[PDB]
Amino acid sequence: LAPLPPHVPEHLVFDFDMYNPSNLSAGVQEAWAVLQESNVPDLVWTRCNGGHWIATRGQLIREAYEDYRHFSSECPFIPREAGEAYDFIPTSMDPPEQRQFRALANQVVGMPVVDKLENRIQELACSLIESLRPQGQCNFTEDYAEPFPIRIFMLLAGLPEEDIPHLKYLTDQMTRPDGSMTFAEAKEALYDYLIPIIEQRRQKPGTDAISIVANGQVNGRPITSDEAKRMCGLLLVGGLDTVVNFLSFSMEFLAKSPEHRQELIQRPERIPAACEELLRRFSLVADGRILTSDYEFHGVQLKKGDQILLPQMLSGLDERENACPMHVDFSRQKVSHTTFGHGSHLCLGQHLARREIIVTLKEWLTRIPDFSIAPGAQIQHKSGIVSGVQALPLVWDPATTKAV
Numbered sequence: 001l002a003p004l005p006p007h008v009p010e011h012l013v014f015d016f017d018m019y020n021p022s023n024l025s026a027g028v029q030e031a032w033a034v035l036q037e038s039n040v041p042d043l044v045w046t047r048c049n050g051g052h053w054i055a056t057r058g059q060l061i062r063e064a065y066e067d068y069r070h071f072s073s074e075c076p077f078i079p080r081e082a083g084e085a086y087d088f089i090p091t092s093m094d095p096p097e098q099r100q101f102r103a104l105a106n107q108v109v110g111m112p113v114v115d116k117l118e119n120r121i122q123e124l125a126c127s128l129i130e131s132l133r134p135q136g137q138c139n140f141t142e143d144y145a146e147p148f149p150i151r152i153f154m155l156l157a158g159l160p161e162e163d164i165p166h167l168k169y170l171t172d173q174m175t176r177p178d179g180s181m182t183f184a185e186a187k188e189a190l191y192d193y194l195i196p197i198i199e200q201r202r203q204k205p206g207t208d209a210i211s212i213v214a215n216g217q218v219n220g221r222p223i224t225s226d227e228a229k230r231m232c233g234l235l236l237v238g239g240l241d242t243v244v245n246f247l248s249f250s251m252e253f254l255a256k257s258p259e260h261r262q263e264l265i266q267r268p269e270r271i272p273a274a275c276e277e278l279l280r281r282f283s284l285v286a287d288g289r290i291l292t293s294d295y296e297f298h299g300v301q302l303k304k305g306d307q308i309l310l311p312q313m314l315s316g317l318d319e320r321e322n323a324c325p326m327h328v329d330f331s332r333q334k335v336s337h338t339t340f341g342h343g344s345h346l347c348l349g350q351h352l353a354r355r356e357i358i359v360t361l362k363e364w365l366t367r368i369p370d371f372s373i374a375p376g377a378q379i380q381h382k383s384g385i386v387s388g389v390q391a392l393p394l395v396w397d398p399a400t401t402k403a404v
C-alpha cells in the first residue's frame with residue numbers, strides 16, 4: 001500500500017487491487033462490482049499499485065472519457081511506470097493529434113478487412129469446431145479461444161504461426177503481468193520483433209497489415225518507421241489479448257445456462273443481440289487516464305499528475321445504467337455499456353471482434369448445441385488491464401452433435 005497523498009481525504013479510500021481483487025473467486029466481473037455496493041462512493045482512491053483514483057459508476061466513467069482536456073491518454077495504464085512507458089499509437093495520444101492515425105488503423109482492422117477476411121474467419125471457426133466435435137470434450141481456452149482469433153490476426157498481419165507462443169507471452173505481460181517482465185521490457189521486446197519486419201515491408205511492400213501501416217499516410221504525409229512500430233505493437237496486443245479472453249467468458253456462461261443455449265438454437269437471428277448483451281455482462285477491459293491539471297470532479301479534488309482508472313467494464317454493470325445488471329437478458333431493450341471504450345478512442349477492432357464472436361456462437365451451437373462445464377471443475381478468472389479465464393474444460397455427448 002502506497003502512502004495516502006495529502007490531498008486525498010481518508011474517507012475516499014477503498015483499497016481495491018485491479019490485478020488481484022479480493023472477490024476474484026466469485027467471478028472477475030463480480031470482483032470489480034464490489035466497487036458498486038451501497039457503501040462505496042462514486043469515486044474512490046486505492047493505495048494499491050502505487051495509488052490511483054477509481055471511477056465506479058458509468059456516469060463518471062463516460063464523463064471522464066469524454067473530457068480529454070482534463071483526462072489525458074498520455075499515461076493510460078496503472079501502474080504509473082507502465083503508463084509512462086506506454087507509447088502505442090493512437091492510444092497514447094489525445095485529440096487533435098491522435099485523429100490522423102485512426103484512419104490508417106481502420107484500413108487494417110476496420111470493416112474493410114473484416115470483408116477481406118469474411119471467408120477465412122468462417123472457414124477457421126467451422127474447421128476448429130468440427131475437429132473438436134467428435135471428442136466430447138475440449139480445453140476451450142487453448143483449443144479454440146486462443147487459436148481462432150490469433151491465427152486470423154497472424155494471417156492478416158502476414159506473420160508465421162510459429163511466432164505465436166512468443167508474441168502471446170509478451171502481450172500477456174502488458175495486461176496480466178506474472179512478474180517476470182515489466183511493461184517496458186515486454187513492450188520493447190515486442191518492438192524488437194517488429195523492427196526488422198517493418199523495414200523489410202517498407203522496402204518490398206506487400207498486402208499484409210504491417211506493410212499497409214508501414215507504408216501508410218496520415219493526413220497526406222508519410223508515416224515514420226517509429227510511428228509504424230508504435231501502431232503495429234498496439235495491433236498485435238489487440239489481436240492476441242482481447243477477443244481471445246471474451247470468447248471464454250461467453251462460452252463459460254453458455255455452458256452454465258441451458259436456457260440461454262436453447263434461446264439461440266431456436267432463434268439464431270438473436271445471436272447479434274445476444275453478443276451485445278454478453279459484451280455488457282462479460283465486459284473485461286479497464287485502463288484510464290492522467291489528470292492534466294488540478295480539477296474538481298463530482299465533489300472530489302483531483303491533482304495534476306493523479307492517475308484515474310476508468311474501468312470500461314464497470315459502466316454496463318452499473319445498476320443505474322441497466323436494471324438487474326448481473327442477469328443476462330438477450331431481449332434487454334436498452335443494452336448500455338462502454339465495453340469497446342468511449343469518447344475519441346472508441347475501439348477500431350470492434351467490427352472484427354463482433355464478427356469473431358457472432359461466427360463462434362453460430363458455428364459452435366450449430367455443431368455442438370449441448371455442452372457443460374466438466375464435472376467438478378471450478379472455473380478460475382484472472383484480472384488486469386484485460387481480464388480473462390485461466391482454463392475452461394467443457395464436455396458434451398458426441399451423440400447429440402452434428403457434422404455440417
Ligand code: HEM
Nearest residue numbers: 090091235238239242243246339340341345347348349353
Ligand atoms: C472483445 C474485444 C475488444 C475489446 C473489449 C476492446 C476494447 C477496447 C477499448 C476499451 C479501447 C479504448 C482504450 C482507451 O480508451 O484507452 C480499445 C481501443 C482500441 N482497440 Fe479494441 N478491443 C477489442 C478488440 C480489438 C481488436 C480485435 C483489435 C485489433 C487490433 C483492437 C484494436 C484497438 C485499437 C487499434 C484501439 C485504439 C483506438 C485509439 O486509441 O484511437 N481491439 N479497444
Ligand SMILES: CC1(C)[C@@H]2CC[C@@]1(C)C(=O)C2
Nearest residue numbers: 091237238285287385386
Ligand atoms: C486497453 C486495450 C484493450 C486497448 C486495445 C488493446 C489494449 C490493451 C490497449 O493497449 C488499448
Ligand SMILES: [K+]
Nearest residue numbers: 074083084086
Ligand atoms: K506514456
